[PDB]
Design a protein around this motif. Structure first.
Motif, PDB file in Angstrom:
ATOM      1  N   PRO A 183      15.178 -21.806  18.720  1.00 64.43           N
ATOM      2  CA  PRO A 183      16.001 -20.335  18.376  1.00 64.43           C
ATOM      3  C   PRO A 183      16.631 -19.638  19.344  1.00 64.43           C
ATOM      4  O   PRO A 183      17.842 -18.743  19.938  1.00 64.43           O
ATOM      5  N   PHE A 184      15.145 -18.793  20.145  1.00 65.57           N
ATOM      6  CA  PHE A 184      15.447 -17.187  21.028  1.00 65.57           C
ATOM      7  C   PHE A 184      16.284 -18.223  22.064  1.00 65.57           C
ATOM      8  O   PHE A 184      16.755 -17.404  23.523  1.00 65.57           O
ATOM      9  N   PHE A 185      15.556 -19.360  22.643  1.00 63.07           N
ATOM     10  CA  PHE A 185      15.832 -19.850  24.599  1.00 63.07           C
ATOM     11  C   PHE A 185      17.516 -19.554  24.313  1.00 63.07           C
ATOM     12  O   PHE A 185      18.088 -20.231  25.423  1.00 63.07           O
ATOM     13  N   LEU A 186      18.553 -20.493  23.179  1.00 65.92           N
ATOM     14  CA  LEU A 186      19.848 -19.808  23.310  1.00 65.92           C
ATOM     15  C   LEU A 186      21.086 -18.698  23.417  1.00 65.92           C
ATOM     16  O   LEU A 186      21.441 -18.798  23.713  1.00 65.92           O
ATOM     17  N   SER A 187      20.455 -18.192  22.988  1.00 62.97           N
ATOM     18  CA  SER A 187      20.183 -16.729  22.897  1.00 62.97           C
ATOM     19  C   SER A 187      19.835 -16.046  24.302  1.00 62.97           C
ATOM     20  O   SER A 187      20.856 -14.869  24.644  1.00 62.97           O
ATOM     21  N   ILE A 188      19.834 -16.787  25.056  1.00 66.72           N
ATOM     22  CA  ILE A 188      19.763 -16.047  26.628  1.00 66.72           C
ATOM     23  C   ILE A 188      20.511 -16.511  27.029  1.00 66.72           C
ATOM     24  O   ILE A 188      21.579 -15.988  28.614  1.00 66.72           O
ATOM     25  N   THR A 189      21.991 -17.436  26.849  1.00 67.29           N
ATOM     26  CA  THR A 189      22.965 -17.472  27.877  1.00 67.29           C
ATOM     27  C   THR A 189      24.110 -17.066  27.133  1.00 67.29           C
ATOM     28  O   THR A 189      24.726 -17.146  28.035  1.00 67.29           O
ATOM     29  N   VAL A 190      24.231 -17.193  26.072  1.00 70.17           N
ATOM     30  CA  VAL A 190      25.186 -15.732  25.502  1.00 70.17           C
ATOM     31  C   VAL A 190      25.056 -14.714  26.230  1.00 70.17           C
ATOM     32  O   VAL A 190      26.121 -14.349  26.604  1.00 70.17           O
ATOM     33  N   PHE A 191      23.880 -14.344  25.878  1.00 67.89           N
ATOM     34  CA  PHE A 191      23.697 -12.619  26.292  1.00 67.89           C
ATOM     35  C   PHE A 191      22.407 -12.951  28.234  1.00 67.89           C
ATOM     36  O   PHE A 191      21.743 -12.552  28.128  1.00 67.89           O
ATOM     37  N   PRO A 192      23.378 -13.391  29.119  1.00 72.11           N
ATOM     38  CA  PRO A 192      22.668 -13.495  30.437  1.00 72.11           C
ATOM     39  C   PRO A 192      22.085 -12.293  31.024  1.00 72.11           C
ATOM     40  O   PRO A 192      21.099 -11.654  31.834  1.00 72.11           O
ATOM     41  N   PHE A 193      23.115 -11.227  30.499  1.00 69.65           N
ATOM     42  CA  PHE A 193      22.302  -9.767  31.054  1.00 69.65           C
ATOM     43  C   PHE A 193      21.479  -8.973  30.272  1.00 69.65           C
ATOM     44  O   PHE A 193      21.110  -8.086  30.831  1.00 69.65           O
ATOM     45  N   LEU A 194      21.106  -9.938  29.223  1.00 67.67           N
ATOM     46  CA  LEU A 194      19.958  -9.269  28.682  1.00 67.67           C
ATOM     47  C   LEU A 194      18.759  -9.585  29.588  1.00 67.67           C
ATOM     48  O   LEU A 194      17.273  -8.891  29.475  1.00 67.67           O
TER      49      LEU A 194
END
Ligand SMILES: CC(C)c1nc(CN(C)C(=O)N[C@@H](CCN2CCOCC2)C(=O)N[C@H](CC[C@H](Cc2ccccc2)NC(=O)OCc2cncs2)Cc2ccccc2)cs1
Ligand SMILES: CC(C)c1nc(CN(C)C(=O)N[C@@H](CCN2CCOCC2)C(=O)N[C@H](CC[C@H](Cc2ccccc2)NC(=O)OCc2cncs2)Cc2ccccc2)cs1
Ligand code: HEM
Ligand code: HEM
Lengths: 439, 439
Positions: A183-194
Motif C-alpha cells: 500500500p505505502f511503497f506504491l505512493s512513492i512513485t506518484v509522489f517522488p517529491f515526498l
C-alpha cells in the motif's frame, strides 16, 4: 517527461498523467514485463510516474550496461523513499561511497571465509532436521517458510554475530525480537517529491525499535568487517551493512528453499535423483562439507533451475549518470535502464518450454547453451550479488540434511500450480505446504 | 547535520533546530559575514537550515577552490527552489551540462565580439544623455536607477536581439512588457524538501507571462548563439540563456552605475578628475570607442573601487562534489564552501580605511598590492563572470557620455551615508537621488 520515449522513437505503452504506467502493475510488474516484451521487442520504455524507465533485452546491450559501462555511466540503482541512515548500506550507496564499501566488504565474501563458515552453519542443519522431525510426526502438512525461516535466521545470527539461537524454540532471545521486524511503497512513485519530506520527518521504512537495538548491539561478518578496519569505516555504517545482510540471509534464502521444495515435491523423480546423488556422495547421512557440496552436480542443477523460474530480484536496474549511445541507441541522462530478469528467464526464445521445471537445462552439456546475460539470478558486473556463493552454499547445506532424512510430497492444501503474489516481493501467493515423510 | 562542524573542530555560531543560523540574517547576511570573520578567523561554519556552509578567507585556499579544484570537486553552485526549465541556464547548470554551455557561450563574450558591439550600444549613450537632459531641466533630483535602468535595458535588447527600443519613452514595445517582470525566498532554506514539490506544481520564480513570450520571440547574443549551432544546442535552452543575460545586463549594470554616481557626487574631487581625464582623451564631447575606453586609467580605477565597496554578488559559493583535504583542512561531501566577497572587500587586514572610497587603491602603483583572491567582484576560475568585459565596457560607455555633458551633486533627498538594503540583493536601501547639472 512523458514525451521522452516518443521523441527518441522508442515504443511503449502510453502513460497517464501523474501515474505513468503504474496502473498496468495490477497484474504484477512481472506479467507487465512479459507483455511488453511480447509486443514491443528488444527495447521499450515506460514511466513509473514521471520517471522514464527503459527496458533492454539484448544480451550485448545488457553486458554493456551491467559490466562494460558500470563505473562510468551505470553505477547506481534507482533510489526509493525515506532511507535514513541506510543510505550508507552497500546496496543503496552510490558512486565512490559504494566503491569504498564494496572494497571493504568484498574479502568478507571470499571462498576462504565461506569455507570457514561451513562447519559453523552446518550445526544448524542438525537443528533444522530436529525442528522438521517433530513437525513431521503430526501427519499434517508443514509450512516450510517457517522451518526454513527459522534455519536461515539461525545462520545469519551465528555467522555474523556468533549469536547461537534456536530461533524456532526460542522466541525469547534478544536477537530474535528485533529481527522479527524484517500500500505505502506504491505512493512513492506518484509522489517522488515526498521523499525529501520523509527524510526530515525521520519516518524510516522500519520501526524505531529495530535500528536502536542493533546500533547498541554493535568467523562472522561483524568480525571480518571490524577486522578490516576512501579507506575508513564508521560505527553507524557497520549496522547498516549488518541490516542489509540479515534481510538477504533470511528472506531470500528461505523463499528460494520453499520454491525448491515445491518443485521437488511436485517432481518426485527429481527428488529421488537428488537423494540418490546425495547418498552416493555422502554415504548414509554423512555430514556435508565445503569440498563435498561443490561435488554434487545435480544439486547445482536443481538450484539453478529454481532460480530461473523464480528470480527473486525480478529486475535489475541502473541509473544513467550521463548521456551515452550503447550498442546503437542513445540513452539520455536520468533514464533508469532496466533488465527484466523474470521475463528473460521465461522467454520462449531462449528457453524450450519455459514454464517447465527441467533441471537438465543446466547439465554440463546444455549449460553452455545458456547466455549469462539472459540468465542473471545474481546480476552481473561489478555490482552483482556479493553474497552469491554464501547464498548458494547456505541453501545447499540445508537441502542436503533435509533430504538425507526426509521426503516431501504434496497435499490437499498445496497450491498446484503455484501462483506468485502480485506484490513487490517474489513469493508464493499462498504459503507452500507439503507432506513430510522420513526415512 | 548540526553537529558536523563541532565534529570537525571548525568554529561557528551555534545553530537552532530547523532554522540553523538564519535568524542571524536579520542584520543582513553581509554583516553576519563580517561579524563571523571578526570573531572566528580564517574559517568558520554555519547552517542555512540543515545545510552546512563553510566560509573560507585564506587566499591560497580560495584559489584552490575557485581555480585548482574546480572541475573535480567544486564545479557547481548551491541550487535554489523551483527552477523549471531554467535548470538549463549556464549559471544554474551543473557538471558536464555546464561545461557544454560554457563552451558554446564563451566565444560570444570574446573581446572581438565586444569590439563589434561598441558602435551599436554607443547609440544609446546618445539616447541616455537626452533622457537625462530633459529630466535635468526640472531643477529637482533624479532617480538614476530608472534612467540607468532604461539605458541598460536598451543595451541588452539591442546587442542580443536587435530590438532598438527607447525603453523610457516607449512603455509600449512588446519587448518591454515582458522584461518589466525581471518573504518567499527565505522559506526555501527551512524547507529545502519543498523544492521537489514546486518542481511538479510548475510554480516557477517568474510569471507564466514572461517565459511564454520569449519562447515564441525565440551583432547580438541571439545570433552568435545560433551561429555556433556534448556538442549540440536546443530551443528552450536558447531562451534560458537569453533570460540569464537580460537580468544580468539590467539589474547589475544599472545598480553599479547608481553606486558609481553616488560616489562621484559625494566625492566631487573624483568627479572632476574623471571629467578631466575624459576630456583629455575625448576632446570636447568626442564619441567614445572600444580602443579609447581602455585608455582611461582613472575611469577604470573608479569602477574598480565602487565594485570593491559594493560587490553585487556578495558571496561566491561552490558545492563539494566529493571528500577533499584542501590547504590543510578536510571538507566532506555536500558542504557548501562560501567566499564572503563583501566581507573580504572591507577587511581592515588587506584594506587601509576600507569604508573610504579611494580610487587611488587601483592605480598602476598600488594595483599590485591587491590579492586577486581577496578582491573578486567577478569571481575567479573556470566559472567566473563570463560577461565581465561586456559589463565593464557597458558601464564605462555610459559614464563617459553622462559625464561629458553633465555634473552630479547631492540633494536634501540624497541618503548620506548610503545604507544597503537588508534583502537578498545588494542595492541601496533607498533610491539614489542626485542633483544633475549640465555643462
Ligand atoms: C512497487 C514496484 C513498482 C517496484 N519498484 C521496484 C524498484 N526497485 C528495483 C527497488 O529498489 N525495490 C526495493 C524495495 C523497496 N521499494 C519498493 C518499490 O519502490 C521503492 C523501493 C528493493 O528491494 N531494492 C533494494 C533496496 C534494499 C532492499 C530492502 C531493504 C530496505 C531497507 C533496508 C534493508 C533492506 N533489499 C536489500 O537490502 O538487499 C538484500 C539482498 C541481497 N540479495 C537479494 S536481496 C536494493 C537491492 C539490493 C539487492 C538486490 C536487489 C535490490 C521494484 S518493484
Ligand atoms: C536569502 C539569503 C539566505 C541568500 N541565499 C543566497 C544563495 N545564493 C548564493 C543564490 O543562489 N541566490 C540566487 C537568488 C535566488 N535565491 C535566494 C536565496 O536562496 C535561494 C536562491 C542568485 O542570485 N544566484 C544565481 C541564480 C540566478 C540569479 C537570478 C535568476 C533566477 C532565475 C532566472 C534568472 C535569473 N542570477 C543570474 O541569473 O545571474 C546573472 C548575473 C551575472 N552577474 C551577476 S548576476 C546564480 C548566480 C549567477 C551569477 C552570479 C551570482 C549568482 C544568496 S542570499
Ligand atoms: C538466493 C539468494 C540471493 C539471490 C538470488 C540474490 C540476488 C541478488 C541480485 C539479483 C542482486 C542485484 C545484482 C545486480 O543488480 O547486478 C543482488 C545484490 C546484492 N546482494 Fe544478493 N541475492 C541473494 C542473497 C544474498 C545474500 C545472502 C547476501 C549477503 C549476505 C546478499 C547481498 C547482496 C548485496 C550487498 C547486493 C548489492 C551489491 C552492491 O550493490 O554492491 N544477497 N542480489
Ligand atoms: C557589474 C556587472 C556584473 C558583475 C559584478 C558580475 C559578477 C558576477 C560574479 C561574482 C559571478 C560569480 C563568479 C563565480 O562564482 O566565481 C558571476 C557569474 C556569472 N555572470 Fe556576471 N556579473 C556582472 C554582469 C554580468 C553580465 C552583463 C552578464 C552577461 C551578459 C553576466 C553573466 C554571468 C554568468 C553567465 C555567470 C555564471 C557563469 C557560469 O556559471 O559559468 N554577468 N557574475
Amino acid at each position: 517527461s512523458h514525451g521522452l520515449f516518443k521523441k527518441l522513437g522508442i515504443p511503449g505503452p502510453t502513460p497517464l498523467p501523474f501515474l505513468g504506467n503504474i496502473l498496468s502493475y495490477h497484474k504484477g510488474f512481472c506479467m507487465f514485463d512479459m507483455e511488453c516484451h511480447k509486443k514491443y521487442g528488444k527495447v521499450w520504455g515506460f514511466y513509473d510516474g514521471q520517471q522514464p524507465v527503459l527496458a533492454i533485452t539484448d544480451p550485448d546491450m545488457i553486458k554493456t550496461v551491467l559490466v562494460k559501462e558500470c563505473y562510468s555511466v551505470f553505477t547506481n540503482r534507482r533510489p526509493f523513499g525515506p532511507v535514513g541512515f541506510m543510505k550508507s548500506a552497500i546496496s543503496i550507496a552510490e558512486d565512490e561511497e559504494w566503491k569504498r564499501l564494496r572494497s571493504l566488504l568484498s574479502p568478507t565474501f571470499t571462498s576462504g571465509k565461506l569455507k570457514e563458515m561451513v562447519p559453523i552453519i552446518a550445526q544448524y542443519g542438525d537443528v533444522l532436521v530436529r525442528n522438521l522431525r517433530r513437525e513431521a510426526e503430526t501427519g499434517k502438512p508443514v509450512t516450510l517458510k517457517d522451518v526454513f525461516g527459522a534455519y536461515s535466521m539461525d545462520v545469519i545470527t551465528s555467522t555474523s554475530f556468533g549469536v547461537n539461537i534456536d530461533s524456532l524454540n526460542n522466541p525469547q532471545d534478544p536477537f530474535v525480537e528485533n529481527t522479527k521486524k524484517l500500500p505505502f511503497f506504491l505512493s512513492i512513485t506518484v509522489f517522488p517529491f515526498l521523499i525529501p519530506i520523509l527524510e526530515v520527518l525521520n519516518i524510516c521504512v522500519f520501526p524505531r525499535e529495530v535500528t536502536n537495538f542493533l546500533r547498541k548491539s554493535v568467523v562472522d561478518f561483524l568480525q571480518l568487517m571490524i577486522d578490516s578496519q576512501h579507506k575508513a569505516l564508521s560505527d553507524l555504517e557497520l549496522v547498516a551493512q549488518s541490516i542489509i545482510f540479515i534481510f538477504a540471509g533470511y528472506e531470500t534464502t528461505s523463499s528460494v528453499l520453499s520454491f525448491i521444495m515445491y518443485e521437488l515435491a511436485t517432481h518426485p523423480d527429481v527428488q529421488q535423483k537428488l537423494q540418490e546423488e546425495i547418498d552416493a556422495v555422502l554415504p548414509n547421512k554423512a555430514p556435508p562439507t565445503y569440498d563435498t557440496v561443490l561435488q554434487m552436480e545435480y544439486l547445482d542443477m536443481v538450484v539453478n533451475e529454481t532460480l530461473r523460474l523464480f528470480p527473486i530480484a525480478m529486475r535489475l536496474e541502473r541509473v544513467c549518470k550521463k548521456d551515452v549511445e550503447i550498442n546503437g541507441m542513445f540513452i539520455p541522462k536520468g533514464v533508469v535502464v532496466m533488465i527484466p530478469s523474470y521475463a528473460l528467464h521465461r522467454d520462449p526464445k531462449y528457453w524450450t518450454e519455459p514454464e517447465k521445471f527441467l533441471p537438465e537445462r543446466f547439465s554440463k552439456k546444455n549449460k553452455d547453451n545458456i547466455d549469462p546475460y539472459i540468465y542473471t539470478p545474481f546480476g552481473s558486473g561489478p555490482r552483482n550479488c556479493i553474497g552469491m556463493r554464501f547464498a548458494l552454499m547456505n541453501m545447499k547445506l540445508a537441502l542436503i540434511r533435509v533430504l538425507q532424512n526426509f521426503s516431501f510430497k504434496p497435499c490437499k492444501e498445496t497450491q498446484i500450480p503455484l501462483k506468485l503474489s502480485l506484490g513487490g516481493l517474489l513469493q508464493p501467493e499462498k504459503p507452500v505446504v507439503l507432506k513430510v515423510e522420513s526415512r
